[PDB]
Amino acid sequence: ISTRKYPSDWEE
Amino acid sequence: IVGGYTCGANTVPYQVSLNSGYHFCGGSLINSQWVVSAAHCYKSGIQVRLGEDNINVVEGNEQFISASKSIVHPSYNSNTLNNDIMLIKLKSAASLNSRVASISLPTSCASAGTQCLISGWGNTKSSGTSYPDVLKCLKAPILSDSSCKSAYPGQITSNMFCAGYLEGGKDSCQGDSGGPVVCSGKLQGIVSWGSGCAQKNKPGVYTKVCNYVSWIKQTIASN
Ligand SMILES: [Ca+2]
Numbered sequence: 001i002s003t004r005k006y007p008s009d010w011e012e
Numbered sequence: 013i014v015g016g017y018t019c020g021a022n023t024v025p026y027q028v029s030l031n032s033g034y035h036f037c038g039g040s041l042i043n044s045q046w047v048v049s050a051a052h053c054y055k056s057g058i059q060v061r062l063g064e065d066n067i068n069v070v071e072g073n074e075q076f077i078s079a080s081k082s083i084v085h086p087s088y089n090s091n092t093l094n095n096d097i098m099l100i101k102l103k104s105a106a107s108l109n110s111r112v113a114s115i116s117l118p119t120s121c122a123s124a125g126t127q128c129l130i131s132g133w134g135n136t137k138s139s140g141t142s143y144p145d146v147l148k149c150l151k152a153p154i155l156s157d158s159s160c161k162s163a164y165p166g167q168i169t170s171n172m173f174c175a176g177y178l179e180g181g182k183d184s185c186q187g188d189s190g191g192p193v194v195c196s197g198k199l200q201g202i203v204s205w206g207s208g209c210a211q212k213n214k215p216g217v218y219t220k221v222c223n224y225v226s227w228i229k230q231t232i233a234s235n
Contacts, residue, residue, distance in 0.1 A: 001091060001167060003052045003205045004134060006036045006143075006187035012055075 014138050014210035016181035021065040022073060022111035024131050024147060024226045026199075027192060028185065029061040030100075031076075038132040038191025040115050040199050041192035044105040046062045046120060046210070046232055047079075049190030050219065051088040051098040051201050060102055063112040066145045067133055073111045078103045080086065083231055085224070096219045098190075099231050117229075118198035121222035123147035124156045128195040128218070132203060134187030136212040140178070144188060150184070152176045155215055162211055171223050175201065176215035184216045195216050 002008035028047055030037040037053035039060065047060055055164025062072040081101040088095045106112055123130075129149045136142045152175045155163075160174035168174070175193060176183050184191070184203045201218035208214055 001205050002207060003050075003054055004026050004184055004186050004189040004209075005050075006034075006134065006189070008186055008218065009052060012036075 013152050013189060014136055014185050016055065016148045016150035019131055019147045019149035022063065024149070025111050025113040026115035027131050027147060029064050029067055029133065030190060031061050035067050035133055035187065037189045038203065039100065040192040041106065041112070042117060043114050043177060043198070044108050045102050047100040047102065048199065048202065048228070049098050049100060049156060050204055051084045051096045052090060052093065053190040054161055055081055055085050055100055058100065062106050065147055068145050070126055075112060075114065076105050077106060081235060085227070088180050092169065093205050095171055096168050097202060097224055099228065101235060110194055115192060115199045116196060116197055118200055118222045121220065122154055122195045122200045124154050126154050126191045126195045128200065130175065130191070130193050130203070132176070132184065132188035132191035135185040139206065151184060152182060160215070163215055164207070164217065168217070171220050172204065172217050173220050174199065174215040174217055178215060180210050180212040180214065183210035227231040
């Protein structure tokens with residue numbers, strides 16, 4: 001499960 | 013968008029950009045004062061950018077309007093991504109013209125095999141990165157629930173559907189989140205998640221909008 005927000009979900 | 017095409021300026025006039033000093037998610041305008049996006053795109057001090065094509069250049073159709081309210085689905089769950097939907101109210105109403113217009117909500121849920129238009133300014137590579145200036149576009153079919161659940165065992169709820177190509181090459185991707193999946197002039201989907209982008213047997217997963225129309229209308233009604 002990887003969300004598709006930029007640049008990534010985890011990077012924020 | 014991986015393996016898609018340049019949409020052409022303002023050919024997708026319901027598509028908006030969510031901006032926090034940089035584009036981070038997409039959304040869909042559903043009336044002059046309200047936008048639909050993904051709950052995981054939520055953050056404070058969002059600037060909604062309507063009428064965009066080249067998000068990096070002023071071309072003269074933009075309305076930049078600040079979000080005044082953000083309403084995440086009450087039962088959004090950030091681990092499972094169930095109910096990945098959010099409503100944003102604009103501080104002032106958008107000026108609705110030709111290049112900036114609403115998309116209709118569905119009356120019924122769409123069915124497997126329908127073609128849809130998926131758009132956004134997300135990544136265009138499935139390995140490394142390349143981020144477009146201009147809005148990208150992809151035609152893709154909704155998959156069966158059987159194939160969806162088989163691609164992501166135990167992770168697909170009644171509020172999600174898969175769309176795309178199981179052989180790879182064509183998908184949404186990081187930067188597309190919150191953006192629209194439109195099937196026969198209705199908003200049926202919101203870019204949500206997947207495993208990698210445009211990978212074999214790993215299609216896009218989208219929020220199933222038809223499940224939410226009552227909650228959307230009532231939320232707009234009471235805010
Ligand atoms: Ca622009």
